[PDB]
Design a protein around this motif. Structure first.
Motif, PDB file in Angstrom:
ATOM      1  N   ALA A  44       4.024   3.162 -17.156  1.00 56.54           N
ATOM      2  CA  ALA A  44       2.672   3.370 -16.930  1.00 56.54           C
ATOM      3  C   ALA A  44       1.833   3.845 -18.039  1.00 56.54           C
ATOM      4  O   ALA A  44       2.699   4.138 -18.936  1.00 56.54           O
ATOM      5  N   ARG A  47       7.377   2.544  -8.393  1.00 59.03           N
ATOM      6  CA  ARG A  47       6.944   3.630  -9.315  1.00 59.03           C
ATOM      7  C   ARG A  47       5.993   4.342  -8.572  1.00 59.03           C
ATOM      8  O   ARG A  47       5.401   5.458  -8.650  1.00 59.03           O
ATOM      9  N   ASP A  56      -3.784   0.867  -8.803  1.00 59.79           N
ATOM     10  CA  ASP A  56      -3.066   1.392  -9.851  1.00 59.79           C
ATOM     11  C   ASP A  56      -2.347   0.288 -10.807  1.00 59.79           C
ATOM     12  O   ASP A  56      -2.420   0.548 -11.983  1.00 59.79           O
ATOM     13  N   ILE A  91      -3.411   0.340 -14.803  1.00 60.00           N
ATOM     14  CA  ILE A  91      -2.239   0.816 -15.665  1.00 60.00           C
ATOM     15  C   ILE A  91      -2.490  -0.105 -16.938  1.00 60.00           C
ATOM     16  O   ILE A  91      -3.056  -1.065 -16.896  1.00 60.00           O
TER      17      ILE A  91
END
Lengths: 423, 28, 49, 51, 54, 378, 110
Positions: B27, F176, G40, G44
């Protein structure tokens, strides 16, 4: 991979490049009309003027060739060379030549076509760069000096080794050899693709279709024992017949009928397959002779199949389609035909279907029973379903007339039927 | 003669493929 | 009568027909030129029935 | 014309073209010596020498 | 014994009175010594006493 | 129970004990990892010679196998063993009492699936590390999401998205995140196998009925459906060579090569593995090559090859039927009797309850040869 | 000044230009949205110039990081370059009596 193999590959790639005088005289001497000497001595201008005259005659015969006069038969076509163009332009040439061969497969009895194709050979080297299309085009003229000469000048792709043994002889190739050729299984896929192309371009004709269907018939005939071969061979011929029926020409319809008849009679198919064959035939039936042939085909298919549920009632859609495309009077006179081909299982199933579905044309049912010479268990099935319809629907005078007809013809069977189920 | 179905050797050439390590990333 | 009798009636009803040997259709090759689809179909049906 | 020959058996190969620009001659490190017409792919000569 | 077996169908021989055999089988070159039908009349065995495997 | 005189060495005459094998590459040398009961072997694929064999027996039988470039991940009763060259080099205990039943690896994330619909995700402690050893997270799927876990896949071009295929539907999990990011519609038929097609976002699912659903993840829809009745699809593979052929291995012990471009059936192979032992338990095209490797449940591993076409012009239409190529095999039943065929200890005869007689090599198992039973004339 | 038409014609003849024939050959013909998104995953960002595979993927010398969506569009272009896109998925999808029932049954049976 030995160096000899790799060089054989490169020689194949450079088959048509004249890297020296001797090789050029070979590639130029190969020709369709003139022998080796005059072929080697003459020139592109001469060959091309002959081609222009011939193709003009052919265009006069039918207007399609004008486009080739535009694109493959110009002075620019005198000029260009196969070898110094890029891959894309090579593919364009190949498409154009394949189209021309498809057109020209129909007039191989005309010296005009002979001359024009001679140009095409001598300038664009079809007899090396694309021989499968040429052979497939002219295969059905296999008893002709034109085909003998094509063999003489051609180099044979690995599928045609039979013709290979007949190159440079003096006697024409024989029907038995052609049957070996078709009896191959890969070649069948090749020829299937060729017919698909011919159909999609609507360019088919009698003699060609005759030869195709006769070869397919003899293929299944020779394979009439090896049942594994037959089973793996079903998909090819039945797909060909499927598309051949999807076509519209009555010639295609008759050919598909013939192939289907022979194949079914030589190998017992499943009920579902025979049903689908019926459905397609009935879907595309159009004209009179096709109607006649299709009717005979259906009769023969039902006389073939035999198993539990042999003569069961036709499904709703199939029966409706059939009565739509066929008339009670037509089938009646068909039965009345002096030959009277054996319509036993088919007629029985037809009658049971009518009994379940319509329940009106009972008098035509009676005429049918009188006209056809049925057999024992089929009649018993008819009587059983008749009892069921009588117990369901209201009693009818024509219905009891049918029963009386049975009384006149084997009331005792009615007795067994009723005692087994009823009073 | 019948068509010759000649068997030959097979030499498995290089087979470049994809990277699941490139697929998975940290990330921001 | 039993299911046995039903089977007997079935088998007694079923009749013979012409089979397909490997040497039956080798003639229309000679007789295939300059003819018509209908006539060819009739000839095949003749040799088959 | 842009050849690509793979002879993975014998040694690395040493290349020479004729001055004419037509024939090609390869000499492997172990015994392989070939002279080939290179365009129409006629193997003119092939020698297997262990030397 | 000259090896034929003529096979007739009753349903038509009875009315013909000069019947034509439905078939004239000839696969046995030698004398005919045993003819037997299957219990359901679908198979017919022909057996010859003279030669082995007959 | 450890001896003091003898020490177990390796196992002859076994090529696959039934669990799906796995393929991989080391530069050029393609290799095939296959389990044998309590141990696993690593074959070459150019000659089907032997390359490696697990030196240490697993306490229980191996359940699932996988392999990235140079490491082989075995998954038996409760743990995951990371092996290099058949040498156990790192154990990984699971924090449950269940059994691991599926396994997939991609990027830095190993992911195991244990029978209580429980997924475990493990990460490498470093981006440049070789094998994952850190326990990243744990996930679970309950009955409201999907049925039992049928397989795990990792589609190409998906950051940390793990595709899970269950008996009812398909799920996408961002690990994740540890979240379900998209669920599929419901399939009427139990799903039995999955495979990630070389095109993007397409996974092939074989049902228990003759259904092959080629399903797209983005549009979330059944792109294509291939119908085969009365057959239990058991393996899928795609041809990466450059032609769009799919190989379907059906549990009735058959193989079917379809062409997707023409919606056609190139060829069907019958009885390439004994049906009673499960038929085709895995079939796989070797990447970038026209070679299909099929392992059965009858101690048999084969390689078939596709020749180039014979048609100069047609080709893709007149595609060749597969030719049988090289193979290895063992006994179906346990051997009844054994003997040594020579003093140099090269060959061993073994006769088993399968009514068969075999001679097995001892050095490199390329020579597992059955002694024919063809009577000499008198 | 542009050439006259007859001048173009004579030029074609004299030079043996065949581009007209090439054009005729080329023109020759036989006449006779997603379902789910991830925030996300969008937001990212990963580094670029840190590894050689991403270095070969990228397109700008001075860039060092890119967001997830661009990163995936470009990585997908990479994967497409690895495996060419085939037509069977590219341009095809499933989504009185007929003619092709026979073909369907042939497909369904062995």
């Amino acid at each position: 991979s030995s160096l000899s193999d790799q060089l054989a590959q490169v020689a194949s790639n450079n088959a048509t490049v004249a890297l020296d005088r001797k090789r050029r005289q070979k590639l130029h001497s190969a020709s369709l009309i003139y022998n080796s000497k005059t072929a080697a001595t003459q020139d592109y201008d001469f060959i091309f003027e002959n081609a222009s005259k011939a193709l003009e005659e052919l265009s006069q015969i039918e207007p399609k060739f004008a486009i080739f006069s535009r694109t493959l038969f110009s002075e620019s076509s005198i000029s260009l060379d196969r070898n110094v163009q890029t891959k894309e332009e090579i593919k364009d040439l190949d498409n154009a030549i394949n189209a021309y061969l498809l057109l020209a497969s129909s007039k191989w009895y005309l010296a005009p076509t002979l001359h024009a194709t001679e140009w095409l050979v001598r300038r664009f080297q079809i007899h090396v760069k694309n021989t499968e299309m040429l052979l497939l085009s002219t295969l059905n003229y296999y008893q002709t000096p034109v085909f003998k000469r094509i063999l003489s000048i051609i180099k044979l792709p690995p599928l045609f080794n039979c013709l290979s043994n007949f190159v440079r002889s003096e006697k024409p190739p024989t029907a038995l050899t052609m049957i070996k050729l078709f009896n191959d299984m890969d070649f069948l896929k090749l020829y299937t693709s060729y017919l698909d192309q011919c159909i999609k371009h609507n360019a088919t004709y009698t003699n060609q279709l005759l030869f195709t269907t006769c070869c397919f018939i003899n293929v299944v005939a020779f394979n009439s024992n090896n049942d594994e071969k037959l089973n793996q061979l079903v998909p090819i011929l039945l797909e060909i017949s499927a598309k051949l029926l999807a076509s519209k020409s009555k010639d295609c319809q008759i050919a598909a009928h013939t192939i289907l008849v022979v194949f079914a009679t030589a190998l017992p198919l499943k009920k579902t397959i025979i049903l689908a064959a019926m459905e397609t035939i009935l879907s595309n039936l159009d004209a009179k002779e096709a109607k006649h042939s299709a009717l005979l085909t259906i009769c023969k298919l039902f006389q073939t199949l035999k198993g539990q549920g042999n003569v069961d009632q036709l499904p709703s859609k199939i029966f409706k389609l059939f009565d739509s495309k066929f008339d009670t009077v037509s089938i009646l006179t068909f039965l009345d035909k002096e030959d009277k081909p054996v319509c036993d299982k088919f007629i029985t199933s037809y009658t049971r279907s009518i009994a379940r579905y319509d329940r009106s044309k009972l008098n035509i049912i009676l005429s049918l029973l009188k006209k056809i010479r049925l057999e024992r268990y089929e009649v018993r099935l008819i009587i059983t379903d008749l009892i069921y319809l009588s117990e369901i629907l209201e009693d009818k005078s024509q219905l009891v007339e049918l029963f009386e007809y049975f009384i006149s013809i084997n009331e005792d069977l009615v007795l067994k039927c009723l005692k087994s189920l009823g009073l | 003669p019948k068509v010759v179905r000649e068997a030959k050797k097979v030499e498995m050439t290089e087979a470049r493929a994809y990277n699941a390590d490139a697929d998975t990333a940290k990330a921001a | 009568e039993d299911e046995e009798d039903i089977a007997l009636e079935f088998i007694n009803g079923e009749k013979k027909d012409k089979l397909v040997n490997m040497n039956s259709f080798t003639s229309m090759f000679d007789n295939i030129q300059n003819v018509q689809m209908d006539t060819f179909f009739d000839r095949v049906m003749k040799v088959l029935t | 014309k842009a050849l690509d020959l793979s002879l993975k058996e014998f040694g690395p190969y040493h290349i020479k073209y004729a001055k004419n620009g037509t024939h090609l001659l390869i000499t492997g490190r172990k015994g392989h010596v070939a002279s080939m017409d290179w365009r129409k792919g006629q193997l003119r000569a092939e020698l297997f020498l262990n030397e | 014994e000259s090896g034929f077996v003529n096979l007739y169908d009753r349903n038509n021989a009875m009315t013909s009175s000069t019947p034509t055999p439905v078939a004239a089988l000839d696969q046995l070159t030698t004398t005919i010594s045993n003819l037997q039908f299957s219990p359901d009349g679908q198979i017919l065995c022909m057996a010859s006493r003279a030669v082995k495997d007959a | 129970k450890n001896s003091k005189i003898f020490s177990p060495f390796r196992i002859i005459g076994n090529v696959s004990n039934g669990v799906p094998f796995a393929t991989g590459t080391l530069g050029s040398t393609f290799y095939i990892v296959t389990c044998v009961g309590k141990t696993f072997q690593i074959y070459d694929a150019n000659t089907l010679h032997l390359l490696f064999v697990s030196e240490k027996e697993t306490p229980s039988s191996i359940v699932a196998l996988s392999a990235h470039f140079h490491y082989v991940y075995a998954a038996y009763e409760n743990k995951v063993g990371i092996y290099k060259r058949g040498i156990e080099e790192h154990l990984l205990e699971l924090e449950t009492d269940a059994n691991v039943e599926h396994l997939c690896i991609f990027g830095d994330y190993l992911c195991a699936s244990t029978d209580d619909n429980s997924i475990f995700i493990y990460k490498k402690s470093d981006p440049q590390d070789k094998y994952p050893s850190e326990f990243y997270t744990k996930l679970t799927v309950t009955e409201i999401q999907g049925g039992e876990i049928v397989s795990l896949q990792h589609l190409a071009t998906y950051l940390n998205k793990l595709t899970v295929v269950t008996k009812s539907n398909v799920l996408l999990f961002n690990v994740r995140t540890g979240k379900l990011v998209f669920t599929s519609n419901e399939f009427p038929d139990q799903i039995t196998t999955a495979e990630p097609a070389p095109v993007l976002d397409i996974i092939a699912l074989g049902t228990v009925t003759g259904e092959v659903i080629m399903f797209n993840m983005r549009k979330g829809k059944r792109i294509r459906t291939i119908k085969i009745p009365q057959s239990r699809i058991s393996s899928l593979s795609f041809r990466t060579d450059g032609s769009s052929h799919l190989s379907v291995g059906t549990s009735s012990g058959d193989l079917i090569f379809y062409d997707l471009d023409r919606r056609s059936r190139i060829h069907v192979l019958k009885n390439i593995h004994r049906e009673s032992y499960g038929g085709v338990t895995q079939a796989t095209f070797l990447n970038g090559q026209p070679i299909i490797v099929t392992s059965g449940g009858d101690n048999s591993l084969k390689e078939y090859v596709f020749d180039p076409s014979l048609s100069q012009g047609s080709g893709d239409v007149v595609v060749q039927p597969p030719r049988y190529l090289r193979s290895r095999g063992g006994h179906s039943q346990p051997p009844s009797y054994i003997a040594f065929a020579d003093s140099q200890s090269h060959f061993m005869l073994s006769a088993s309850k399968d009514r068969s007689l075999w001679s097995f090599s001892l050095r490199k198992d390329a020579q597992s040869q059955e002694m024919s039973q063809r009577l000499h004339k008198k | 000044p542009p050439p006259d038409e007859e001048e173009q014609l004579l030029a074609k003849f004299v030079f043996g230009d065949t581009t007209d024939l090439q054009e005729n050959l080329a023109k020759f013909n036989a006449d006779f949205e997603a379902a789910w998104i991830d925030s996300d995953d969008e937001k990212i960002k990963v580094p670029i110039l840190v590894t050689n595979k991403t270095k070969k993927l990228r397109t700008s010398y001075n860039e060092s990081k890119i967001n997830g969506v661009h990163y995936i569009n470009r990585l997908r272009s990479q994967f497409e370059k690895i495996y060419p896109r085939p037509k069977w998925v590219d341009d095809e999808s499933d989504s009185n009596g007929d003619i092709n029932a026979l073909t369907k049954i042939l497909s369904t049976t062995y």
